[PDB]
Amino acid sequence: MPVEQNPPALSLYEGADSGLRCNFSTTMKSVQWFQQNHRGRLITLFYLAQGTKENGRLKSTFNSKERYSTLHIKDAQLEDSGTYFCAAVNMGYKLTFGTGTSLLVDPNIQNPDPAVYQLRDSKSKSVCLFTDFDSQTNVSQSDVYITDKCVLDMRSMDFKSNSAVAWSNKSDFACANAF
Amino acid sequence: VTQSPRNKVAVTGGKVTLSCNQTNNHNNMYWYRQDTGHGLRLIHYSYGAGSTEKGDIPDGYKASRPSQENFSLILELATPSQTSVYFCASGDPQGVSYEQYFGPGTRLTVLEDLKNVFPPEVAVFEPSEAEISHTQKATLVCLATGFYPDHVELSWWVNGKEVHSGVCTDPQPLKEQPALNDSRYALSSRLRVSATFWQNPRNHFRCQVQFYGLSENDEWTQDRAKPVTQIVSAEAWGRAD
């Protein structure tokens, strides 16, 4: 394809660095890098006609002759999660998009203590919470539902934690046999 | 760059107009659609006021540039394949820069029938005493269920103010019936606070879910409530227990 992005997906830990790559099939006039967060907004990170640019913890390089562009992230923060798009302008002056690199930033869990808790409804359906597991844990799995994990940041305590939820209407469902 | 509407539900065969407005006095305006495995693809563009040009994938769409500021995308006969997120952009060709400036996007859902549109049911689940006793932290869970289409915006409000820490929402909604076409969706979110904050009965917790559904202009003659764009909430007061 005219604009190729590598890797398709990336997992990294908070505080780590990573370099994203973008390769072109033809001579490009310029490159534009974007971050698309969970809110769906396309945020311009860089516009380059040549050379290198810095933007906070990000750095980008464009080399028209060698047909590539890179995007570097230093000291990854949870806010860096999202899809990173590379788009380049051809000699026909049209902006062509890559299919994006999906980046997920994981916390470094200080004291892992995987635990399953039962929560009841505030009103008069049962809910199970799986929490405090390390970021290497993958949450798997008809009348039962299990979500993917998410990281929350209790900034008031400088504390981060992972969690997933399971629920069911079925009578035979218990939190002991949920995750 | 601004776009209107930000969300729209349309029926197969209906007419849809997406509007874009820029205040940059840029000669060029563009309409894209975003789809998984395709990035953003150009539909129509305009190299100046009064004129429009076909992009890479123009079929099924028309464009209108009635002024320097406005660029509209028209779907004369909406089809389900036109369900997508649409982005408008502007660019300045007078200078040397090829940079483009993007709108916030419009989420469009084209359905065969509006009877498949449902707002969420929302419920808040109070913290486990076992979590409180072991960690001196308290996690509340919000569950939004039975909604269609899949886009909602969930937020937590504590003592009448939106909170921006101690929260996380599932990356994607899940299908309540994965085998089924037109399956309704579920989404959960967590709010974690200190045990002493949760235990204070002066503290109020509310989970709010913004749902985007039908508009005022859509016809509705069914028995159940019209599934218009609305906010569905569930709340809980803190308690010592």
Residue numbers in the entry:
A (entry chain A): 3 to 126, 129 to 145, 149 to 186
B (entry chain B): 5 to 245
Paper text:
Interestingly, the Vα11Jα9-Vβ8.2 TCR (designated clone name: A11B8.2) was detected in 12 out of 16 sorted clones. As these NKT TCRs displayed non-germline-encoded residues in both the CDR3α and CDR3β regions, this suggests that these T cells had expanded in vivo prior to their isolation. Of particular interest, the type II NKT cell-derived Vα11Jα9-Vβ8.2 TCR+ line (A11B8.2) was clearly labelled by CD1d–α-GlcADAG tetramer (~20× higher than CD1-endo tetramer MFI). In contrast, CD1d–α-GalCer tetramer or CD1d–sulfatide tetramers failed to provide staining of this cell line above CD1d–endo tetramers, highlighting that α-GlcADAG is indeed the preferred ligand for the A11B8.2 TCR. The type II NKT TCR (A11B8.2) bound to CD1d–α-GlcADAG with Kd value of 14.6 μM, which was ~2-fold higher affinity than that observed for CD1d-endo (Kd = 33.4 μM). Binding of this TCR to CD1d–α-GalCer could also be detected, although with a much lower affinity (Kd = 66.5 μM). Notably, none of the variants lacking the uronic acid on the glycosidic group was able to elicit responses by the A11B8.2 NKT TCR+ cell line nor allow CD1d-tetramer staining, highlighting a high degree of specificity of the A11B8.2 TCR towards the glucuronic acid. To gain insight into the mode of recognition of the A11B8.2 TCR for CD1d presenting a microbial α-linked glycolipid Ag; we determined the crystal structure of the unligated TCR and the A11B8.2 TCR–CD1d–α-GlcADAG ternary complex to 1.7 and 3.0 Å resolution, respectively.
